[PDB]
């Protein structure tokens, strides 16, 4: 999404990850973990990445 003067070559060196964090010991931990896992299973996270 920028004028193609640059490009990405080669696989990434290390690994990381993003998570919809919740405060320690809260009641929205398990349902949010389930929501993220179920979203990723159905590709609603791959349909969104391919969009933006």
């Amino acid at each position: 999404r920028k004028p193609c003067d640059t490009m990405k070559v080669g696989g990434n060196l290390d690994s990381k990850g993003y998570g919809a964090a919740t405060p320690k010991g809260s009641a929205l931990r398990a349902p949010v973990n389930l929501a993220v896992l179920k979203l990723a299973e159905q590709g609603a996270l791959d349909k969104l990445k391919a969009k933006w």
């Binding site: 999404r1 690994s15 990381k16 990850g17 993003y18 998570g19 919809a20 964090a21 919740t22 405060p23 320690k24 010991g25 809260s26 929205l28 931990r29 349902p31 949010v32 973990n33 389930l34 929501a35 993220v36 896992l37 179920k38 979203l39 990723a40 609603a44 996270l45 969104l48 990445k49 969009k51 933006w52």
Partner: protein, 104 residues
């Protein structure tokens, strides 16, 4: 209700054109706003998206153990979810409880 904390300016959360015309969370939408709409329908809550004020992700300052920005807004109980790209790190993990990655 619950209060969400999103960082800005990225590919993730952006401010819409005619942001002043719109109001509430609808004034700014993006990838991680579309995501934080789907998680609602699986955890069944109505929120109001609230951008972090400081504009930093978070780290305990060396002098004072004060967590800044988006993780700080969680630790101190100011707001609940963190629907934004928080890298899963050990130091953040020992304080805050994450989810499984939604992107690698």
């Amino acid at each position: 209700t619950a209060v969400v904390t999103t960082i800005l300016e990225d590919p993730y959360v952006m401010a819409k054109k005619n942001a002043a015309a719109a109001e509430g969370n609808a004034a700014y939408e993006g990838y991680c706003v579309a995501l934080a709409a789907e998680i609602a329908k699986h955890a069944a809550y109505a929120y109001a998206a609230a951008i972090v004020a400081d504009g930093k992700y978070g780290a305990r300052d060396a002098a004072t153990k004060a967590w800044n920005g988006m993780v700080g807004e969680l630790v101190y109980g100011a707001a609940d979810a963190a629907a934004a790209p928080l890298t899963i790190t050990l130091v953040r993990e020992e304080v805050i409880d994450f989810s499984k990655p939604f992107m690698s």
